[PDB]
Symmetry: C2
Subunit: 441 residues, 2 copies
């Protein structure tokens, strides 16, 4: 009953369809590793050290998951580094497959397998019960199309079916804009919300299940990776506490040419229509509010860099200790400190909207990160001393993404060449096959 | 022209006088060192390590400056640890003496010299031009009675006489509720605002003039002491950015029995009259706003303790390094880090209102503190190593105020006994002299 072919809905819902399509205008893709090469060091051993960009329009979700170095260059349906779960927050064909094959059936196997199947842009069936007769009437009929997100909302005491309209508005966004990890042997998406959504809760959660995303290749620390915790951090901030919904800012009610009200589906920066977003609740002018938000961004950026610098030193200092013959027992307390420091930093800044949604919480989290970084480096200086090393550990030149990637042993020329081959040759075949199978226009 | 005898105004301005007097109800004097023994270590070698309480009602300003161990037990007008400047933010007799003796003359002398002269409670002439014929008519005629405060407001580009009513309201409070230091041979009160009011501005200011408040007796670090930066931090926070004045929250307009409006002079906790404070601008329930403010208090407290724990270790590790033979040159970089780390911590939490006035700014400052503390301790571990020490430096038992004070070499029994003698013997003599000379009663 899932209709992943979004254009099916264009005749009946032109205003929503046209604005939805318009996120294709949000096309600039900012390379975050180029901007901040420290990230390559922090994520050494993990695919984020190869390729990490800031988000752009929803229209690009399928493209970007296909093009990122993180998904590699699979040669067949059982090849490639990543599992099916990488599709989960990119396309309504995910809802289609979960319905068709069941949740476990969907998650089984490799990302490559989904290539000729997950082909429609993030769209109507991701957020709407389009099968309801009320939908054609122009009623939204919001729904959670993602069972793992439904379970998560229940876990935090906010079951979707019991939630009011305004709670539901943010929850649809909360199907994807969250911290997650891959759970069990099928690598199913799970939001680590069992103990609560605060950084401390999630840290306790992951430690109790002895989970790690990867081992940092420099320090051998069993690491946790944070991802875009918008739902969690929005909940923590002033707007979320007042149930100012994601939609209030990102999907304002606007008028069509005929003066009819509809929800603007061109999901982007709220400051691009300040008059219909912030101005709904605030008397301050646009420049005044922009300056405040920019101020928080700078405050957080400055502290974020300080934490990252401390962590860069910590990873290289851990490397020096290992290279000097440090044992597993000797390294363990240091690795615990690095893991916790970096977890707190990563959850703090992994959402590019933190300085807006919950600046005070971002700053708090960074402070607690810094505490554990201090511990790591102090433990390390003593351990290194016991090996006869009493000088400051020198760091290689990591002033550029290229240098940082070189330093951690990536062959970026080759990795990029192989991906480019994959993009040019495999993607068109995937699209051709989906068309032949009637999954794609 | 200054009338320091507040009761003079009782018949003319009963509603203001009676509510002003009622801060005597805010009488709990909470021992901050008892609640947080870490403070004794951080302030080791400074009077705050002896006695530091949370603020109470304005009515207690004179008694509290008299009774604190910080001002000691002077035997005569030329004795005691502190200068005349400690009276400055405590009583309208200060305004009287500045007029009578000039500002320079007022500041010249030890604190003990002012004892028989500075006897009336913080009051009308501190905030009002009581000599103005308009004041007798019920007009506030707000004034800056403190020249050093007028100069500071000028230094931040806000000359009082050009400021509007709303700006002036907070400036009156900003005569005392600020970070300050003692300047020159006369030890005049000066606000370190010449380069701006941000922690970074003040830090650079104090470093440029190579100023220090004391030398920490453990680490031998040339330290800076922060004090109650409400004006600076209020300015940084969301309320200050919107010119929500100190008065809007702490001195609301209320009605008397006859239904006539007056300004409530019982300056205390805004939540005591939520209906006429926050509820004028906010639609949220009292309990909802209390819960948010309490959450920020906890967030800041948690991080505050983490920074203090790091600084406690840093001071004792510095002590260990000095004990191991570290030279002045070897210690300098470490002491630079300790100085900066502690300055940032102290300014962050020296205001008991920070979690309300500017929580994000308090949190930010603490993060920057933690950066420099990490640096201090890492440097220390390497230095200690060069002296043949590679183990963690153990800390004495500081689980209570009494233990911490013992640990840093204070004879608290002696100090308290000497102060009790002074309080019981000298204070009545001061009051008798003041009454004799028509200053009191
Ligand atoms: C499996 C490990 C993957 C891979 C390879 C990708 N995703 Fe996601 N994704 C989600 C959201 C909300 C965003 C935008 C917000 C943000 O990025 O901060 C993204 C973005 C991306 C991109 C574009 C940015 C980039 O990293 O270069 C790419 C290439 C990408 N993803 C690949 C949401 C989710 C999930 C919600 C639970 C899940 C699961 C994933 N993504 C998984 C993956
Ligand atoms: C989440 C990322 C969504 C996508 C993808 C689509 N829609 Fe949407 N829609 C969404 C929200 C949060 C809302 C507002 C609900 C509310 O409580 O106000 C809507 C609204 C609609 C409506 C109702 C009419 C209106 O308010 O404009 C319709 C008919 C609608 N949306 C249609 C629609 C179409 C055709 C989509 C694919 C092109 C589509 N939506 C995607 C959330 C999301
Ligand atoms: C999973 C199906 C998602 C749902 C439901 C929502 N979002 Fe999303 N968003 C998602 C991805 C994978 C991306 C990145 C796309 C890319 O190719 O980079 C985004 C991006 C955004 C952005 C950034 C837009 C830009 O930079 O131009 C915003 C502001 C955003 N998303 C907000 C948002 C809102 C408010 C949602 C509920 C209505 C929502 N998203 C749902 C994935 C998914
Ligand atoms: C106003 C009170 C908002 C609410 C509620 C939500 N968002 Fe937001 N978000 C808002 C602004 C003004 C900005 C940009 C800040 C800037 O410096 O310009 C953002 C940012 C995001 C992003 C980052 C997008 C990017 O291009 O980097 C995302 C992914 C995002 N917002 C999503 C999001 C979600 C999922 C929300 C509900 C949980 C949500 N936002 C609420 C304004 C507001
Ligand atoms: C109502 C639906 C709102 C919209 C749209 C925006 N804001 Fe908001 N804001 C709102 C409330 C109810 C509050 C709490 C204060 C109160 O009135 O009780 C706020 C608060 C802020 C703040 C201060 C808190 C913070 O998180 O820093 C800022 C800086 C702020 N709002 C900015 C802002 C911006 C930039 C918006 C458009 C992107 C915006 N708000 C929309 C209510 C609502
Ligand atoms: C204005 C620039 C001041 C100067 C100069 C001094 N003090 Fe002060 N004091 C001031 C304020 C605004 C407050 C309340 C806010 C707070 O956080 O404390 C105080 C409080 C006191 C107290 C009561 C609390 C305590 O510390 O136990 C005492 C005993 C006190 N002040 C003493 C004191 C001394 C000895 C001074 C000279 C070094 C001194 N004060 C100067 C404002 C100002
Ligand atoms: C600062 C700590 C003050 C003290 C001490 C005293 N007053 Fe006050 N007063 C203060 C302010 C900030 C205001 C409000 C001014 C405004 O802009 O609204 C006032 C107000 C008055 C007034 C005006 C009438 C009114 O609003 O109630 C009068 C007549 C007055 N105050 C008298 C007064 C008396 C008699 C005092 C000593 C007992 C006194 N004030 C102390 C600031 C401060
Ligand atoms: C110096 C002459 C001051 C002026 C002018 C203002 N304040 Fe004050 N305040 C001052 C001191 C020395 C103290 C501590 C008194 C003690 O003995 O502990 C205070 C205290 C406060 C408090 C705390 C009250 C309590 O805890 O019960 C508050 C909330 C406060 N002050 C606010 C305040 C306001 C709003 C002012 C402008 C109208 C103001 N103060 C002026 C010193 C001085
Ligand atoms: C509302 C927007 C306020 C503004 C403007 C000012 N203050 Fe405030 N302050 C407010 C509250 C609700 C509280 C108590 C917080 C709590 O946890 O209950 C405070 C606290 C203070 C304190 C500390 C008092 C204490 O007893 O520890 C002081 C000294 C203080 N406030 C003074 C002060 C000054 C000088 C202001 C203008 C520069 C100011 N406040 C503004 C609420 C609000
Ligand atoms: C009008 C003169 C106000 C009074 C009285 C109080 N607040 Fe306020 N608040 C006001 C504004 C203009 C804003 C900015 C948001 C906006 O609407 O533009 C706020 C914001 C807050 C916030 C969020 C920001 C923050 O500093 O954390 C909180 C938590 C808040 N206000 C609480 C609060 C309390 C507890 C008050 C009484 C002691 C209070 N406000 C009074 C305006 C005004
Ligand atoms: Ca973007
Ligand atoms: Ca994760
Ligand atoms: Ca108090
Ligand atoms: Ca000071």
């Amino acid at each position: 009953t899932v209709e992943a072919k979004n254009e099916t809905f264009a005749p009946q819902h032109p205003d929503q369809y046209l604005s939805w399509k318009a996120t294709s205008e949000q096309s600039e893709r900012v390379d975050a590793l180029a901007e901040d090469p420290r990230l390559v060091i922090l994520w050494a051993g993990y695919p984020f050290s190869r390729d990490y960009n800031k988000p752009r329009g929803h229209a690009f979700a399928v493209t970007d998951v296909r093009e990122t170095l993180r998904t590699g260059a699979p040669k067949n349906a059982e090849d490639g580094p990543l599992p099916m779960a990488c599709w989960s927050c990119k396309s309504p064909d995910v809802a289609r497959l979960i319905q068709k094959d069941g949740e476990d059936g969907y998650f089984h196997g490799k990302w490559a397998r989904g290539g000729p199947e997950i082909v429609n842009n993030l769209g109507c069936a991701d957020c709407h019960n389009t099968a309801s007769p009320e939908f054609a009437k122009g009623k939204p009929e919001l729904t959670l199309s993602r069972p793992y997100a439904a379970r998560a909302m229940e876990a935090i005491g906010k079951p979707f079916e019991k939630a009011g309209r305004f709670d539901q508005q943010s929850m649809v966004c909360g199907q994807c804009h969250v911290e997650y990890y891959f759970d069990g042997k099928n690598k199913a998406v799970k939001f680590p919300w069992d103990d609560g959504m605060k950084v401390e809760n999630m840290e306790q959660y992951y430690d109790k299940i002895a989970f790690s995303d990867w081992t940092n290749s420099l320090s051998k620390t069993p690491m946790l990776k944070a991802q875009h915790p918008e739902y969690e951090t929005w909940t923590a901030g002033i707007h979320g506490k007042n149930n100012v919904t994601c939609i209030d800012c990102h999907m304002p009610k606007v008028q069509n040419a005929e003066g009819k009200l509809y929800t603007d589906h061109k999901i982007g920066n709220p400051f691009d229509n300040f008059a219909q977003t912030c101005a709904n609740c605030h008397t301050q002018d646009k420049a005044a509010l922009q300056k405040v938000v920019a101020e928080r961004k700078q405050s957080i950026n400055d502290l974020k860099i300080k934490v990252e610098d401390q962590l860069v030193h910590a990873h290289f200092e851990a490397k020096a200790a290992l290279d000097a013959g440090a044992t597993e027992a000797e390294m363990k307390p240091i690795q615990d400190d690095i893991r916790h420091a970096q977890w707190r930093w990563d959850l703090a800044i992994a959402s590019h909207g933190i300085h807006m949604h919950a600046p005070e919480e971002g700053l708090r989290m960074l402070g607690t990160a810094m505490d554990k970084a201090a511990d790591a480096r102090t433990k390390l200086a003593r351990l290194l001393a016991t090996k006869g090393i009493t000088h400051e550990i020198q760091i290689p030149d990591i002033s550029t993404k290229e240098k940082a990637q070189q330093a951690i042993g990536l062959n970026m020329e080759q990795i990029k060449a192989e991906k480019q081959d994959f993009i040019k040759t495999v993607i068109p075949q995937w699209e051709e096959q989906a068309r032949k199978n009637g999954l794609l226009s």
